[PDB]
Amino acid sequence: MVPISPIETVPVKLKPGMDGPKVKQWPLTEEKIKALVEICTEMEKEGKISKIGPENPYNTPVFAIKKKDSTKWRKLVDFRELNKRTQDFWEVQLGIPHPAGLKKKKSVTVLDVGDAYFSVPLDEDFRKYTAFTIPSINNETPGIRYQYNVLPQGWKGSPAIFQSSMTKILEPFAAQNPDIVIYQYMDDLYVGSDLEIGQHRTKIEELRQHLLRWGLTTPDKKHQKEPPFLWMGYELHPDKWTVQPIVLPEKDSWTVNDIQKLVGKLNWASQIYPGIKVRQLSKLLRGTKALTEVIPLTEEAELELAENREILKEPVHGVYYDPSKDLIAEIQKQGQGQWTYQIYQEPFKNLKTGKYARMRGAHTNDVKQLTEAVQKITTESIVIWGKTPKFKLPIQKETWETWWTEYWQATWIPEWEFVNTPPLVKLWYQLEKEPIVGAETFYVDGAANRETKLGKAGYVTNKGRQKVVPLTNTTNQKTELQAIYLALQDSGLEVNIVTDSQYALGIIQAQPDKSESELVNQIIEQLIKKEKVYLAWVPAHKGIGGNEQVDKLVSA
Amino acid sequence: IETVPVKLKPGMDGPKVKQWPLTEEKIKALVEICTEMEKEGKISKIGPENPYNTPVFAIKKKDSTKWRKLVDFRELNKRTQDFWEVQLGIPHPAGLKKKKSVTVLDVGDAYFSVPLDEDFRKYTAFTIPSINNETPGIRYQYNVLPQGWKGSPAIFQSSMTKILEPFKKQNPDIVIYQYMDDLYVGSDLEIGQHRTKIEELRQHLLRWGLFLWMGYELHPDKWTVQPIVLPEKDSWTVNDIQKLVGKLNWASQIYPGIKVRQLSKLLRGTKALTEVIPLTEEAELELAENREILKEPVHGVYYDPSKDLIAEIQKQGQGQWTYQIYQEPFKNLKTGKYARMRGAHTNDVKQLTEAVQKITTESIVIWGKTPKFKLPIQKETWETWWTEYWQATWIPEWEFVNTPPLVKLWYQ
Ligand SMILES: Cc1cc(/C=C/C#N)cc(C)c1Nc1ccnc(Nc2ccc(C#N)cc2)n1
Ligand SMILES: NCC(=O)Nc1ccc2[nH]c(=O)[nH]c2c1
Numbered sequence: 010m011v012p013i014s015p016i017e018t019v020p021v022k023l024k025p026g027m028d029g030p031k032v033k034q035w036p037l038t039e040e041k042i043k044a045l046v047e048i049c050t051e052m053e054k055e056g057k058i059s060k061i062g063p064e065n066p067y068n069t070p071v072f073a074i075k076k077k078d079s080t081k082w083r084k085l086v087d088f089r090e091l092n093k094r095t096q097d098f099w100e101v102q103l104g105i106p107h108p109a110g111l112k113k114k115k116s117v118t119v120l121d122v123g124d125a126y127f128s129v130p131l132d133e134d135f136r137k138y139t140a141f142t143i144p145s146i147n148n149e150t151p152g153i154r155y156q157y158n159v160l161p162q163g164w165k166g167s168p169a170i171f172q173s174s175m176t177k178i179l180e181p182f183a184a185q186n187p188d189i190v191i192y193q194y195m196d197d198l199y200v201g202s203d204l205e206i207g208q209h210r211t212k213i214e215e216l217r218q219h220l221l222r223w224g225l226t227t228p229d230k231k232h233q234k235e236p237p238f239l240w241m242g243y244e245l246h247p248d249k250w251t252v253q254p255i256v257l258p259e260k261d262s263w264t265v266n267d268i269q270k271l272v273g274k275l276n277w278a279s280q281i282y283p284g285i286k287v288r289q290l291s292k293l294l295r296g297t298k299a300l301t302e303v304i305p306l307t308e309e310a311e312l313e314l315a316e317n318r319e320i321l322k323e324p325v326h327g328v329y330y331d332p333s334k335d336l337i338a339e340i341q342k343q344g345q346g347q348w349t350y351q352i353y354q355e356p357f358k359n360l361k362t363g364k365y366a367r368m369r370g371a372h373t374n375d376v377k378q379l380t381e382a383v384q385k386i387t388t389e390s391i392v393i394w395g396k397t398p399k400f401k402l403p404i405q406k407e408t409w410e411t412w413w414t415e416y417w418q419a420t421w422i423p424e425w426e427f428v429n430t431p432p433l434v435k436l437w438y439q440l441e442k443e444p445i446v447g448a449e450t451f452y453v454d455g456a457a458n459r460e461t462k463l464g465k466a467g468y469v470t471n472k473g474r475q476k477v478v479p480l481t482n483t484t485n486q487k488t489e490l491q492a493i494y495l496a497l498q499d500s501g502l503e504v505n506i507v508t509d510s511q512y513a514l515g516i517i518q519a520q521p522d523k524s525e526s527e528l529v530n531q532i533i534e535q536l537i538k539k540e541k542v543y544l545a546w547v548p549a550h551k552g553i554g555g556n557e558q559v560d561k562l563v564s565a
Numbered sequence: 566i567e568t569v570p571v572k573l574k575p576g577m578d579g580p581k582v583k584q585w586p587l588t589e590e591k592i593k594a595l596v597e598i599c600t601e602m603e604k605e606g607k608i609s610k611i612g613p614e615n616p617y618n619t620p621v622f623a624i625k626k627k628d629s630t631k632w633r634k635l636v637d638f639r640e641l642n643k644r645t646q647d648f649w650e651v652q653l654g655i656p657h658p659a660g661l662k663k664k665k666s667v668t669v670l671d672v673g674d675a676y677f678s679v680p681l682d683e684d685f686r687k688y689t690a691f692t693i694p695s696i697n698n699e700t701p702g703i704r705y706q707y708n709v710l711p712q713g714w715k716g717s718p719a720i721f722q723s724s725m726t727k728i729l730e731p732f733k734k735q736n737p738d739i740v741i742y743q744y745m746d747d748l749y750v751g752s753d754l755e756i757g758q759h760r761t762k763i764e765e766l767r768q769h770l771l772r773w774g775l776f777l778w779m780g781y782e783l784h785p786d787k788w789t790v791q792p793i794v795l796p797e798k799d800s801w802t803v804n805d806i807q808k809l810v811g812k813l814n815w816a817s818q819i820y821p822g823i824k825v826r827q828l829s830k831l832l833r834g835t836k837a838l839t840e841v842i843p844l845t846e847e848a849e850l851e852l853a854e855n856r857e858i859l860k861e862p863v864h865g866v867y868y869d870p871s872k873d874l875i876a877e878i879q880k881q882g883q884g885q886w887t888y889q890i891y892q893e894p895f896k897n898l899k900t901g902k903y904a905r906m907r908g909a910h911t912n913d914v915k916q917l918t919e920a921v922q923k924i925t926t927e928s929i930v931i932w933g934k935t936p937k938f939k940l941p942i943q944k945e946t947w948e949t950w951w952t953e954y955w956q957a958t959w960i961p962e963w964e965f966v967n968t969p970p971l972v973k974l975w976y977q
């Protein structure tokens with residue numbers, strides 16, 4: 010006997026105040042019982058389970074399933090009840106690696122660890138909770154009772170405990186072999202390196218020897234598995250990666266569910282295929298939720314779809330990360346709140362692509378959206394590469410400076426350079442900081458009756474220009490905007506506007522270039538045509554001249 | 566030695582807080598620091614049976630070549646029991662803010678000499694993440710009192726009192742106040758003498774059984790404030806008068822006696838914004854009466870230790886920031902303004918982060934607690950950048966203002 014190091018057990022507890030499962034065992038056919046007896050007999054021989062006495066109060070149901078078409082039975086224990094009662098664990102495999110963060114490898118070998126998979130010992134004190142019963146033939150004898158000595162398949166703590174145990178075993182090998190990488194997925198280990206094939210092969214044997222110290226055998230028969238690997242929806246190749254094939258279906262009629270599937274594929278595709286757009290297609294999914302309901306595709310959605318098909322016509326691949334080179338991120342505006350980006354090191358070879366969509370809200374502008382896209386790409390890049398890319402942005406340096414210096418919020422974007430690739434992000438208007446000499450002064454107001462919803466909006470000016478418009482189906486807030494709109498509409502290229510509306514100031518000081526409000530949009534259109542606009546606020550009902558007059562007129 | 570038992574408040578589990586993404590340089594720094602700490606027995610690796618997490622990162626303090634581990638214990642601190650039994654409270658010295666110089670020392674390293682209660686250690690779990698999650702995050706918990714944790718100053722307090730005994734009896738005028746990992750030492754004496762006494766204080770800690778060398782000098786007696794002030798002008802435009810009436814209307818929510826009636830009538834008629842309006846003598850009297858009112862303190866302003874402090878900040882432009890600290894609206898316990906630079910001239914977010922730190926420091930000196938911030942910035946922008954500029958060993962609470970305040974105008 011060659012002594013092996015034991016694997017230390019992780020201490021496990023039930024959730025506070027909870028006891029173990031007591032669940033009735035289903036009756037089974039005579040054939041299932043016999044097959045389970047045989048399976049458990051074998052498992053018992055290997056030390057995976059042990060027979061127990063009647064004293065253990067616990068039970069979990071056991072099943073037997075024949076695969077599809079076949080004569081072979083396998084044992085399935087239904088752990089649902091025990092899982093509800095088992096403590097939460099630290100889960101490591103959250104946050105899977107992104108292929109674009111991986112490094113190219115000359116060789117990647119797969120090692121079958123299935124032996125270890127079913128061999129990790131279970132905490133001695135927790136074993137009683139895993140009890141199960143094979144029903145007896147005809148129910149004329151007590152059922153055969155067993156509990157697990159090892160991590161059971163399907164138990165809540167099995168994946169975390171297996172991963173942590175394997176990791177601890179592998180740690181010294183990884184540390185003392187900085188020239189390889191090791192990754193564990195299911196019952197396999199993947200070992201890559203850049204070593205010349207002889208040295209690589211030697212590292213693999215050494216790893217097999219290292220694992221032997223815990224008694225973990227790997228088959229002499231070497232893995233049929235070779236690159237490319239199909240993993241987590243990706244194809245990984247030694248020098249490149251892509252997403253697994255994406256084929257958009259041909260359809261005469263589109264179901265809600267069909268459209269959800271389409272968007273899913275497109276979203277998945279967008280991390281490599283540059284320029285993917287989901288806006289119009291996603292719109293069709295609003296409200297509803299009835300899965301089998303068919304929707305007509307709008308002309309816009311048809312167009313988006315056709316554009317996507319073109320983008321998807323042939324395979325595209327990403328390259329891997331070279332830590333010795335800068336990361337560059339370039340962003341383009343696509344229209345309708347849509348933004349697309351590429352991240353690369355060398356020109357024309359992307360590591361990855363992606364998209365950003367405008368956040369929901371009443372009012373917005375391109376600069377805010379661009380800023381949000383930058384922050385998102387920044388955060389994604391920290392995750393994947395541990396660093397911020399240098400940005401190439403379709404906005405002039407002077408535009409950005411004018412923006413951030415005058416914007417009411419603190420705002421910043423990291424190191425970036427202008428790339429001239431229309432459409433450019435620009436400021437459509439900027440209001441004056443001081444009142445304009447020589448420019449006509451419009452005092453605006455509006456009011457509405459909450460009940461009848463009748464209202465008025467208008468202005469009076471220092472030149473004695475005046476307007477009042479009667480309005481139906483309106484609110485006080487709408488009349489306040491309407492009044493500003495009228496002053497813009499009726500003034501020359503330079504204008505001073507005086508309003509008491511805190512609501513309107515709040516919106517305009519947010520500097521929107523687009524709005525869900527038709528009225529805000531009309532105001533923006535008017536601002537764009539002006540040379541100079543000064544907007545001044547005053548408190549209502551203070552006896553402020555020209556403000557009180559117009560207030561009088563618009564009230565009743 | 567011989568740990569004090571600690572518990573979470575009743576009906577709550579330990580923190581599970583996601584580790585946020587860390588740069589390569591911060592990860593490398595943390596791996597190095599933690600390897601040493603593990604060697605020193607301060608922390609130990611943990612297993613998958615520990616579900617808990619608290620975020621960690623690393624900072625660079627003022628003029629230093631070395632990273633400092635910073636754990637964000639904000640969630641754990643909320644969930645940790647308040648400290649009552651032996652110490653019922655730390656009545657806050659009101660004299661600290663009056664001192665000519667207050668130096669801030671990082672004393673946090675002293676905490677590592679006290680073992681942490683064995684049943685509570687699991688709640689201190691933290692993770693060093695790996696780039697692109699390529700290798701499993703390195704999981705640790707504390708064996709001793711962690712820096713940044715609420716319980717550490719509470720638990721260490723008896724040791725601290727004994728340590729500083731000879732310095733205090735020797736230096737009776739010197740005010741020493743402790744908040745989290747910081748010690749605040751005030752003195753009214755000459756700055757060269759002050760530094761001498763500070764270095765004298767270091768030795769007490771240094772000579773005992775062991776970023777302490779550092780110090781951060783404040784002069785709270787020079788801390789200024791911002792009364793409401795109105796323009797003094799020879800010629801007022803219609804616009805000037807509108808801005809004045811607007812400012813006075815706002816002020817009248819604070820100071821009740823304020824009147825706009827006479828001033829508002831200067832605006833009679835519909836006039837060009839830039840036209841100059843002579844003040845009527847009744848307008849001048851009203852303005853005069855208003856000025857006098859604004860020279861007085863706000864009425865019924867008092868600090869309540871049972872209530873949160875709230876801090877609002879406005880960007881004034883050109884590196885200028887104004888702020889107010891209050892409990893109830895319109896009762897400001899402190900107002901202030903920073904015209905400062907300290908780099909950051911091209912970076913708004915850096916400036917804001919520095920303002921947040923300064924205001925928190927002022928808050929700690931004055932009330933002995935940190936305020937809750939209302940920050941003029943989008944969540945995503947703040948959350949992406951603030952850790953890059955953070956120099957402080959504590960972190961306050963914040964929320965985000967998405968709607969531009971009209972009152973920025975009146976603090977300008
Ligand atoms: C995450 C991961 C998944 C698999 C495999 C999962 C599966 N199935 C295999 C390995 C070795 C890794 N780990 C790492 C770490 C750093 N660089 C790389 N680069 C890299 C990986 C695979 C190929 C290929 N072909 C090329 C380069 N892999
Ligand atoms: N006085 C009006 C005005 O300066 N408007 C304006 C509009 C768009 C701009 N883009 C800039 O970089 N500066 C701008 C200024």
Ligand SMILES: [Mg+2]
Pocket residue numbers: 454455456509549550560
């Ligand atoms: Mg009105």
